[PDB]
Design a protein around this ligand. Structure first.
Ligand SMILES: O=c1cc(Br)cc[nH]1
Length: 165
Protein backbone atom coordinates (compact mmCIF):
# COMPACT_ATOMS: atom_id res chain seq x y z
CA UNK A 1 0.00 0.00 0.00
CA UNK A 2 1.18 3.66 0.73
CA UNK A 3 4.65 3.93 2.24
CA UNK A 4 6.72 6.63 3.95
CA UNK A 5 3.74 8.76 4.97
CA UNK A 6 3.80 10.80 8.16
CA UNK A 7 0.56 10.32 10.14
CA UNK A 8 -1.03 13.72 10.97
CA UNK A 9 -4.38 12.56 12.40
CA UNK A 10 -6.53 9.31 12.67
CA UNK A 11 -7.14 9.54 8.91
CA UNK A 12 -4.82 12.15 7.30
CA UNK A 13 -1.31 11.16 6.16
CA UNK A 14 1.31 13.28 4.34
CA UNK A 15 4.43 12.65 2.21
CA UNK A 16 6.86 14.81 0.19
CA UNK A 17 6.27 13.14 -3.16
CA UNK A 18 5.40 13.72 -6.78
CA UNK A 19 1.72 12.62 -6.97
CA UNK A 20 2.28 11.23 -10.53
CA UNK A 21 5.14 9.04 -9.27
CA UNK A 22 3.12 8.11 -6.21
CA UNK A 23 0.08 7.13 -8.37
CA UNK A 24 2.23 5.03 -10.75
CA UNK A 25 3.83 3.19 -7.82
CA UNK A 26 0.74 2.54 -5.71
CA UNK A 27 -1.99 2.48 -8.41
CA UNK A 28 -4.52 3.52 -5.73
CA UNK A 29 -8.25 3.07 -6.08
CA UNK A 30 -8.64 6.86 -6.27
CA UNK A 31 -6.22 9.60 -7.24
CA UNK A 32 -7.56 13.14 -6.76
CA UNK A 33 -6.95 15.70 -9.47
CA UNK A 34 -6.75 19.42 -8.66
CA UNK A 35 -9.22 20.19 -11.42
CA UNK A 36 -10.84 23.36 -12.81
CA UNK A 37 -14.57 23.59 -13.81
CA UNK A 38 -13.73 22.99 -17.47
CA UNK A 39 -11.49 19.92 -16.77
CA UNK A 40 -8.75 21.71 -18.83
CA UNK A 41 -5.64 19.96 -17.34
CA UNK A 42 -3.08 22.58 -18.41
CA UNK A 43 -0.72 22.92 -15.46
CA UNK A 44 -0.06 22.11 -11.82
CA UNK A 45 -1.18 18.69 -10.61
CA UNK A 46 -3.77 18.52 -13.46
CA UNK A 47 -1.25 19.14 -16.20
CA UNK A 48 1.15 16.62 -14.68
CA UNK A 49 -1.52 13.92 -14.18
CA UNK A 50 -2.84 14.45 -17.71
CA UNK A 51 0.69 14.27 -19.21
CA UNK A 52 1.27 10.93 -17.37
CA UNK A 53 -1.86 9.50 -19.10
CA UNK A 54 -0.49 10.56 -22.58
CA UNK A 55 -3.42 13.04 -22.81
CA UNK A 56 -6.05 10.27 -22.36
CA UNK A 57 -7.36 12.10 -19.25
CA UNK A 58 -7.93 15.26 -21.36
CA UNK A 59 -9.69 13.36 -24.18
CA UNK A 60 -11.98 11.67 -21.65
CA UNK A 61 -12.56 15.00 -19.82
CA UNK A 62 -13.49 16.85 -23.02
CA UNK A 63 -16.13 14.21 -23.78
CA UNK A 64 -17.36 14.51 -20.15
CA UNK A 65 -17.69 18.34 -20.51
CA UNK A 66 -19.36 18.09 -23.96
CA UNK A 67 -22.06 15.84 -22.39
CA UNK A 68 -22.43 17.38 -18.90
CA UNK A 69 -21.18 20.95 -19.00
CA UNK A 70 -18.71 22.40 -16.51
CA UNK A 71 -18.36 21.31 -12.91
CA UNK A 72 -19.18 23.71 -10.04
CA UNK A 73 -16.36 25.25 -7.96
CA UNK A 74 -16.38 22.95 -4.87
CA UNK A 75 -17.73 20.08 -6.97
CA UNK A 76 -16.28 16.93 -8.44
CA UNK A 77 -16.71 14.09 -10.90
CA UNK A 78 -15.37 10.53 -10.98
CA UNK A 79 -13.63 9.58 -14.22
CA UNK A 80 -11.06 6.87 -15.18
CA UNK A 81 -7.76 6.80 -13.41
CA UNK A 82 -6.09 5.54 -16.65
CA UNK A 83 -2.53 4.17 -15.97
CA UNK A 84 -2.39 5.99 -12.58
CA UNK A 85 -5.34 4.74 -10.50
CA UNK A 86 -8.66 2.81 -10.82
CA UNK A 87 -10.47 6.20 -10.76
CA UNK A 88 -9.60 9.85 -10.79
CA UNK A 89 -11.74 12.08 -8.61
CA UNK A 90 -11.54 15.49 -10.32
CA UNK A 91 -12.16 17.98 -7.52
CA UNK A 92 -12.53 21.73 -8.16
CA UNK A 93 -11.10 23.80 -5.33
CA UNK A 94 -11.56 27.60 -5.42
CA UNK A 95 -8.87 29.40 -7.44
CA UNK A 96 -7.89 32.50 -5.45
CA UNK A 97 -6.07 33.89 -8.57
CA UNK A 98 -9.59 34.00 -10.20
CA UNK A 99 -11.27 35.83 -7.25
CA UNK A 100 -13.07 32.58 -6.25
CA UNK A 101 -14.47 32.24 -2.71
CA UNK A 102 -11.92 30.49 -0.39
CA UNK A 103 -14.94 29.37 1.73
CA UNK A 104 -15.67 26.79 -1.08
CA UNK A 105 -12.53 24.84 -0.06
CA UNK A 106 -14.52 22.95 2.63
CA UNK A 107 -17.17 21.96 0.01
CA UNK A 108 -14.35 20.81 -2.28
CA UNK A 109 -12.83 18.55 0.46
CA UNK A 110 -16.28 17.09 1.29
CA UNK A 111 -16.07 15.28 -2.06
CA UNK A 112 -13.27 13.09 -0.54
CA UNK A 113 -15.76 11.65 2.02
CA UNK A 114 -17.42 9.60 -0.75
CA UNK A 115 -14.24 7.46 -1.08
CA UNK A 116 -12.79 5.21 1.62
CA UNK A 117 -9.18 5.88 0.65
CA UNK A 118 -7.62 8.48 -1.63
CA UNK A 119 -4.21 9.67 -2.87
CA UNK A 120 -4.57 13.48 -3.14
CA UNK A 121 -2.89 16.84 -3.45
CA UNK A 122 -3.72 19.81 -1.14
CA UNK A 123 -6.77 21.44 -2.74
CA UNK A 124 -6.45 25.08 -3.90
CA UNK A 125 -2.68 25.04 -3.11
CA UNK A 126 0.06 25.80 -5.72
CA UNK A 127 -1.14 27.59 -8.85
CA UNK A 128 -4.66 27.84 -7.33
CA UNK A 129 -3.29 30.55 -4.98
CA UNK A 130 -4.58 29.53 -1.55
CA UNK A 131 -2.46 29.19 1.61
CA UNK A 132 -1.39 25.50 1.75
CA UNK A 133 -1.31 25.61 5.60
CA UNK A 134 -5.02 26.63 5.51
CA UNK A 135 -5.77 23.88 2.91
CA UNK A 136 -4.21 21.22 5.17
CA UNK A 137 -6.25 22.56 8.11
CA UNK A 138 -9.50 22.41 6.06
CA UNK A 139 -8.53 18.91 4.89
CA UNK A 140 -7.99 17.54 8.43
CA UNK A 141 -11.19 19.23 9.71
CA UNK A 142 -13.37 18.10 6.74
CA UNK A 143 -12.16 14.74 5.42
CA UNK A 144 -13.15 11.72 7.55
CA UNK A 145 -11.99 9.04 5.08
CA UNK A 146 -8.31 7.93 4.69
CA UNK A 147 -6.46 10.65 2.72
CA UNK A 148 -2.77 10.26 1.72
CA UNK A 149 -1.55 13.73 0.75
CA UNK A 150 1.34 14.07 -1.71
CA UNK A 151 3.14 17.46 -1.37
CA UNK A 152 5.47 18.06 -4.34
CA UNK A 153 7.56 20.90 -2.85
CA UNK A 154 10.04 19.68 -0.03
CA UNK A 155 10.28 23.15 1.56
CA UNK A 156 6.45 23.44 1.67
CA UNK A 157 6.17 19.83 3.04
CA UNK A 158 8.58 20.77 5.88
CA UNK A 159 6.66 23.97 6.62
CA UNK A 160 3.34 22.05 6.66
CA UNK A 161 4.58 19.31 9.06
CA UNK A 162 6.47 21.74 11.34
CA UNK A 163 3.47 24.11 11.64
CA UNK A 164 0.74 21.43 11.99
CA UNK A 165 -1.44 21.96 15.01
O1 LIG B 1 4.63 18.88 -12.41
C1 LIG B 1 4.09 18.66 -11.32
C2 LIG B 1 3.36 19.60 -10.58
C3 LIG B 1 2.80 19.26 -9.40
BR1 LIG B 1 2.03 20.61 -8.33
C4 LIG B 1 2.87 17.94 -8.89
C5 LIG B 1 3.55 17.05 -9.62
N1 LIG B 1 4.16 17.40 -10.78
Amino acid sequence: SFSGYLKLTDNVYIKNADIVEEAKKVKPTVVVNAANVYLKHGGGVAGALNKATNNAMQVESDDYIATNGPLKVGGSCVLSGHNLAKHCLHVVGPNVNKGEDIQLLKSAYENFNQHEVLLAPLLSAGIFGADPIHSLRVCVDTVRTNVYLAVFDKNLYDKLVSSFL
